[PDB]
């Protein structure tokens, strides 16, 4: 189930990060470090963490 | 000369990252094409990188 949609492009600098393009559907699984979300980019099939404010909740 | 202000709370997960509280004054030294910025946090005196969306120009 999709939980969020990316609002801004996020390109990893760190190997544990999830790349996001604008509009990407994301399933947010959990918060790791405060305001870091672990998610699944449903478009790319990748998993990783990203800064939480990059994603906006959607009904899915 | 402040260039930006932080608009989102950013807690570093990674060693190179700059912690941001909302409204922190920032001097952005490097905007990279991967949409990370490298800055001096003018409140905390720290330096590091943070995601471009988390700051706006003043």
Set down the secondary structure blueprint.
The complex is a heterodimer of chains A (60) and B (58).
Chain A: E1 4-6, E2 25-31, E3 36-41, E4 46-51, E5 55-57
Chain B: E1 4-6, E2 25-31, E3 36-41, E4 47-51, E5 55-57
Antiparallel strand pairs in B: 1-2, 1-5, 2-3, 3-4
PDB class: signaling protein
Keywords: Regulation of JNK cascade, signaling protein
Assembly: dimeric
Describe the fold and architecture:
Chain B: It is found in: Cytoplasm; Cytoplasm, Perinuclear region; Nucleus; Endoplasmic reticulum membrane. The complex is a heterodimer of chains A (60) and B (58). Chain A is mainly beta and 60 residues long. Chain A has a single domain (4-57), classed as SH3 type barrels (Roll). Helix content of chain A is 0%, strand content 42%. Chain A has no helices and five strands. A five-stranded antiparallel beta sheet of chain A has the order 4-3-2-1-5, with no helix packed on it. In chain A, a hairpin with a 4-residue loop joins strand 2 (25-31) and strand 3. Chain A is globular, with a radius of gyration of 10 Å. In chain B, 28% of the residues are buried. With 58 residues, chain B is mainly β. Chain B has one domain: SH3 type barrels, CATH 2.30.30.40. In chain B, strand 3 and strand 4 (47-51) form a beta hairpin. The A-B interface holds A 7-11, 13-14, 16, 32-36, 49, 51, 53-54 and B 8-14, 16, 34-36, 49, 51-54.
